[PDB]
C-alpha cells in the first residue's frame, strides 16, 4: 500500500484541517522507530489514515473519552477506538529558527467535537453581545493559534507527528 506517500510525507497539515489519506484496494512496532505505538482494541474493509502536528505532551488527547485542546477543539474520537496509532518526533523536521508558524491548532470554539469531524473555519468566534462581523479585538478573537514550534523545547513542547489508523467495518 502507499505507505511512503502517507507516512514519510515532507509536509503534514496543521490539525485544524487534518488530512485523510484513506487507503484501500491493497512489523512497524518491531525494530523500534517511534514514540507512541498503541494498537487499541487489539482484515479490514474501510481503513482510514490521518496525520497532523502535535507536541510531545498532548498525544494523551487523541483517544476515546479523553479531554483537552487537541481532543476537544481540534480532533476527537469515539469511545470504542479500534485501530493502531503511530506517534513519533518531528523536531529535526518541524522546527525552524525563531519560529515555526507553518503549523496551527484550533483554540477558540464554542463546543468540542463529536468523533471525526473536520472543521477549518477562520470565522470570528462570537464572544459578547457586542458583535464581531469579522472585526476582532476584544469580545471578538481569531479562533486558532499557531504551534510556533521550535527546537530547544524539552520533553514537553516539541512537535511529534502522528499516524491514526482507524478502521470501519460496515
Amino acid at each position, epitope marked *: 500500500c502507499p505507505f511512503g506517500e502517507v507516512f514519510n510525507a515532507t509536509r503534514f497539515a496543521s490539525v485544524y484541517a487534518w488530512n485523510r489519506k484513506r487507503i484501500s484496494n491493497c512489523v512497524l512496532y518491531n525494530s523500534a522507530s517511534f514514540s507512541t505505538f498503541k494498537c487499541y482494541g487489539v482484515c479490514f474493509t474501510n481503513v482510514y489514515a490521518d496525520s497532523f502536528v502535535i507536541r510531545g505532551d498532548e498525544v494523551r488527547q487523541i483517544a476515546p473519552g479523553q479531554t483537552g485542546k487537541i481532543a476537544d477543539y481540534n480532533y476527537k474520537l469515539p469511545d470504542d477506538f479500534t485501530g493502531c496509532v503511530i506517534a513519533w518526533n518531528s523536531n529535526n523536521l518541524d522546527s525552524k529558527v*525563531g*519560529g515555526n*508558524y507553518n503549523y496551527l491548532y484550533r483554540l477558540f470554539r464554542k463546543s468540542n467535537l463529536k468523533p471525526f469531524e473536520r472543521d477549518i473555519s*477562520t470565522e470570528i468566534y462570537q464572544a*459578547g453581545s457586542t458583535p464581531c462581523n469579522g472585526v476582532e479585538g476584544f*469580545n471578538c478573537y*481569531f479562533p486558532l*493559534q499557531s504551534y*510556533g514550534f521550535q527546537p530547544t523545547n524539552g520533553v514537553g513542547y516539541q512537535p511529534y507527528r502522528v499516524v491514526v489508523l482507524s478502521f470501519e467495518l460496515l
Partner: antibody
Amino acid sequence: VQLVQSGAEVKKPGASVRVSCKASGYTFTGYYMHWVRQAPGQGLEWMGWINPISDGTNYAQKFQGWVTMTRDTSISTVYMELSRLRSDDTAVYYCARGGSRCSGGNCYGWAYDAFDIWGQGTMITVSS
Amino acid sequence: SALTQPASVSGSPGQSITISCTGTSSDVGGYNFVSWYQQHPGKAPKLMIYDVSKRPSGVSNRFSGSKSGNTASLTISGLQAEDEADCYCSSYTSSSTFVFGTGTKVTVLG
C-alpha cells in the same frame, strides 16, 4: 526577543509608503502585532493591529481604510501602508508587540511589552 | 475612547508621586486591564506596569499601582531625576479597540 523597523522614508504628498516591522527570537504568531503613531510633540495614538496568523485587522476610528496592515510568514516580517499621505501624517510610527497568548490560567498577560526602533516618516515636496 | 490623565505632575527628590488615570465605567471600571508605559525623549516606549498591579522584570520595585472604581493609579516611590519622562496609561475596551491616555509629563524638582 527583539524587533527592528525599516528605515526612515520620505514621500511627496499624495503618495504611499511601505513600513516594515521584523521579529527576531520569539514566536511571531502567538502575540498580536499592533502599531502606534507619535507625531512630534504629541502623545501616542493607537492605530490598529494585525493577526500574524493569515489575516485580520482592527483600526481606530481615524486611521481606517487609508492605513493598511499586512504580514508575511517567511521572514517574520509585518508591513504597514499609509495611503493618501498628507503633510501632517509626518510622524514616528511604532510597531507594537503585545497580545493573544490566552484568556486562561496557565498562560496570560497583555500590554505591549516589546516596542521597536522609531521608524520616521517625513512628508514634503522638496527633492533629495 | 477617552481615559483621562493630568497633563503635568511635579515631584521632589526622594518623595513619592501619584499619577491617576481616570476612566468611567467602561474599561477602567470593570476591566482590570490598565497598563502604563514610560517614554524618554528620543527613546521608544517601555512597559512600566501591566495587569493593573503587576510589574515586568527589570522594572524597579519603586514603581507600583492599583485600580479601583473609576481611577487607576501609578505611584513612583523614592523619585529620581532618572525617572523624568512621559508616562502614558492604557486600557483596552468593550469597543474592541485599544486606547491610550492623554499623557503625563513628570518633572523632578531640584
